[PDB]
Design a protein around this ligand. Structure first.
Ligand SMILES: O=c1[nH]cnc2c(C[N@@H+]3C[C@H](CO)[C@@H](O)C3)c[nH]c12
Ligand SMILES: O=c1[nH]cnc2c(C[N@@H+]3C[C@H](CO)[C@@H](O)C3)c[nH]c12
Ligand SMILES: O=c1[nH]cnc2c(C[N@@H+]3C[C@H](CO)[C@@H](O)C3)c[nH]c12
Lengths: 282, 282, 282
C-alpha cells in the first residue's frame, strides 16, 4: 500500500476545510448510474484531479468527480466514476476513497453497479439487491486489506459474512413495494471478476455453479474496506444483460448494451436510491 | 504494461524491413510441437534475442525463435518456444508477440499446447479442439488487457464467448475425417492455471467440477489479446497425460512423460496443422 | 524472486556456524500452536531479526523466532511465527525459511495451522490431518515457484499429488489411537485463500462445493517449496471454528475465538506432535 495513515488524514482534512458539507452517507455510482448526482441539492463538486492523494483518472471519459450535498434529507458525498482494478489500479488505490469517506464522518456506504445476469430468472432492467458476494480476486491475494493493518481503521481479520446490512435490505424491499413496480426487487449474490474482457460460456457456467447471481468487476473491494472501517453497507446491481450461457447463441456481451440498459433503467434507480435515503438511520 | 504503442510498432517495422515475408497466419507451437517449423518453405529464422523489445528467453533451453515462411500455401510466422507466466513474465510480455503479429498483417492465430486430460474419455495421444476456455488467472486480475486500453488495438471490454472460431473448428473436424484416424478429433474446454507445479488430486477434481476437459498453463492470454486485436482464433491441445484423479494411483505427472507424448504424437499434429492451412481463408 | 541461491546458502552457513545443532525435522507452528517450542530440550533461540536475509517481522506481536533443539529424540528447528501472504510478503519471502531448512540438512517438514471447518462433521477442537490441498492463489499465479527455477533446489515442474506423505498420515492415525481420544483423528483437504478478511457465506459455500474440508491462509506455499526440495511433508489443522454456512446465523468468525480454541486445544497438539516425532524416520 502506497498510502500512509497521514495521507488519508490529509485528504480528509483538506476536503473538510474546502466544504461546509459534512456527509453521513457515501454513494458510489456505478456505470450509467451517475445521474444520481443531479438530485443532490446545494451540490458542491470536486474533480478527483484537484483532491490530494486521489488516484488520478486515466482516459475512460476523463470525468471523475466527488459531489457533496443533500439527497432527500441526507447529507451525502457521491463518487461519479469509480476506479477499477482492470484499469491498472492496485486495490489500495481503488478503495482509497472509502477510507477518506470514513475520516470525513460517513457511516454508510451505498454501492451500485451494472452487472451481467447469471441467475436465469433475472431480466435486463432488473435490480438485484446484494445479499452476499464471492470475492474471486480476494481468494488469490487481491484483497484491498493485503499488507500491514492499521489498528486505527480496523482489525487485522475483519468478518464479511455480515457485510451487507440485513436491515437496509429489508427496508429496500419495502421502498420497492411503495414504488409499486411490475417486476419485484431481485436479490442475490454478486461475484466479482477482474475483467476487463467479458466472460466466455464455460466461465459463465463456472460462475453459475459457484452460486453467483450477478457478475461485475468492481464493488467487493470497496465493501471490504468499508466493512473494515465500520461502515454500514447496502448496495445493488442493475442487470444490464444476461451473460451468454449456451454456444448456440449468436450474441455477445458489449459495453454498448450495458450503457444502453443503464440509460433506460436510469431514473428508476435514481428514485429508489433517493427514496431509500429516508430509510437510512443517522 | 511496460510497452507503449510505439514499441509494438517499432518491433513490427523492424521485422517487416528484415524479411520480405508478409505472414497472414501466426502459429504458436506448444511444448514438443516445435517440429512444425520444419515444414515451412523458404524458412527465415529470427532469434527472439535479436528482435527489438522481445522478451529475452531465460534458460529452458535458451531456444526461442520466430520462423517466417510458407506452410502449405499460407504465408506464416511461427513461434518456436512461447513465454509462460510461471517463468516470471507478466502477461503483457507473454502476449507481446501477438500484438506484433497483428501489426505485421496477420489475421489468424493458431495456438497449440500440451495438456493434462481432465475429461476421463480422453487418452494420451488424443487431440482436443478448443471450443472454449476457463481463465482462472483472469478472474483474479491476471488478464493481459489489465491497464489502460489502447483504442488502436481494440476496445476496453472485448468479448470472449466467441473467441474460438466456430467455422475453423468445423473445418478441422473435416480435415481430421480426411485424415482417416482411428481416434476421433476430441473437443472441449481448456482451463488455464499458472503452474508451474502440477495439480494435486483435490485440484484436478475442482477443475473437473468446473467443467474443464484439459488443463495447461498457457494459451488463454495469447487468445484474449488476439481476439482483442480482431484475429481469427483456432487452436488445440495434445493430451499428453491423464491428470491423477484418485488417491490410490501411484503415478505422478512429470515433464518427462509430457515431452515423450509430444515426441510420439509429434508428426500427427504437424500434418493436421499443415493440411488445416488450406482450410484457412485469406 | 529477490533471493539468489547464494542468499539461501549464506543464511544456512550462518546458522550452521552459530549452532552446533543440526536439525533433521523442521516444524512450522501455526497460530496458537507455538507452545510446541517449550518441549524442545537444549533449546537454542534465534530471533528472525538477527538471521541474515530473513523476512523481518512486521507488528503482529513482533515475535518471530527460530528455535533449534531436540523434540522426543529428533533434532528439530521450529518456526514460532510464520509469514503470511496477507501481510504483504510475496511468496518467495514466505517460503524462504523452507529452502534454508533444506540446506541446513532437514529432510522433513511438519506444518500445522488453525483453520475454519468447511466439513460439517468437524467440530471446534478437532484435528484434521491434511491429505491434500486446493491452492487457489496458485491457480492465479501466486505460486512460490513462479520465476526462473534453480536446478539446485528442484525441477521446473514438481508434482504435488503425492505432497502429503502417505506413510506419515497412517502412522499419525496410530499415534492418535495410542492417545486414546474421544474424538477420532479427522482427515481431509485444506484449501488456502489469501485472506486476511474472513469468508462470506457465499464463499464458504463455494469452498464447500470445491470439496475442501478446512480453510486457512497459509501452509500450501511452504508445502510446495518443501516438496520441490525433496522434503517429506506431513501436517495438520486445528479446527478453531465452523465457518458460517447459512444466513440465519448471527455469529461471525473472529481472531478472538480462533486464538481461544488454539489456547484450550493447545497441549493436545503438542503431545501429538512430540509423540509423532518417534514415527518420523531418519
Ligand atoms: O456480462 C457482464 N460480465 C462482467 N461484468 C459486467 C457488467 C459490469 N461492468 C460494466 C462495464 C462494461 O460494460 C464494466 O466496467 C463491467 C455488465 N455486464 C457484465
Ligand atoms: O497435467 C498437467 N497439468 C497442467 N499442465 C499440463 C501440461 C502442459 N504444459 C506442459 C509443460 C510441462 O511438462 C508445462 O509448461 C505445462 C501437460 N500436462 C499437464
Ligand atoms: O474461518 C476461517 N477462515 C479462514 N482462515 C481461518 C483460520 C486460520 N488463520 C487464523 C488466523 C485468524 O484468526 C489467520 O491467520 C487465519 C481460522 N479460522 C478461519
Amino acid at each position: 500500500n502506497g498510502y500512509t495513515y497521514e495521507d488519508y488524514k490529509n485528504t480528509a482534512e483538506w476536503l473538510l476545510s474546502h466544504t461546509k458539507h459534512r456527509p453521513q452517507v457515501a454513494i458510489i455510482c456505478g456505470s450509467g448510474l451517475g445521474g444520481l448526482t443531479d438530485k443532490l441539492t446545494q451540490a458542491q463538486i470536486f474533480d478527483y484531479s484537484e483532491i490530494p492523494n486521489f488516484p488520478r483518472s486515466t482516459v475512460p471519459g476523463h470525468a471523475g468527480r466527488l459531489v457533496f450535498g443533500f439527497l432527500n434529507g441526507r447529507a451525502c458525498v457521491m463518487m461519479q466514476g469509480r476506479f477499477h482494478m482492470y484499469e491498472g489500479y492496485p486495490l489500495w488505490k481503488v478503495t482509497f476513497p472509502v477510507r477518506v469517506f470514513h475520516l470525513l464522518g460517513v457511516d454508510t456506504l451505498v454501492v451500485t453497479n451494472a452487472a451481467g445476469g447469471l441467475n436465469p430468472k433475472f431480466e435486463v432492467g432488473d435490480i438485484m439487491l446484494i445479499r452476499d458476494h464471492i470475492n474471486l480476486p480476494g481468494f488469490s491475494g487481491q484483497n484491498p486489506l493485503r499488507g500491514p493493518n492499521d489498528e486505527r481503521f480496523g482489525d487485522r481479520f475483519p468478518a464479511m459474512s455480515d457485510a451487507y446490512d440485513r436491515t437496509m435490505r429489508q427496508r429496500a424491499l419495502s421502498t420497492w413495494k411503495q414504488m409499486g413496480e411490475q417486476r419485484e426487487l431481485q436479490e442475490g449474490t454478486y461475484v466479482m471478476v477482474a475483467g476487463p474482457s467479458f466472460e466466455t460460456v464455460a466461465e459463465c457456467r463456472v460462475l453459475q455453479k459457484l452460486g453467483a447471481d450477478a457478475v461485475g468487476m468492481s464493488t467487493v473491494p470497496e465493501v471490504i474496506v468499508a466493512r473494515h472501517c465500520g461502515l454500514r453497507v447496502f448496495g445493488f446491481s442493475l442487470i444490464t444483460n444476461k451473460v451468454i450461457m449456451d454456444y448456440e447463441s449468436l450474441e455477445k456481451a458489449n459495453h454498448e448494451e450495458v450503457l444502453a440498459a443503464g440509460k433506460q433503467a436510469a431514473q428508476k434507480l435514481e428514485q429508489f436510491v433517493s427514496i431509500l435515503m429516508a430509510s437510512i438511520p443517522l
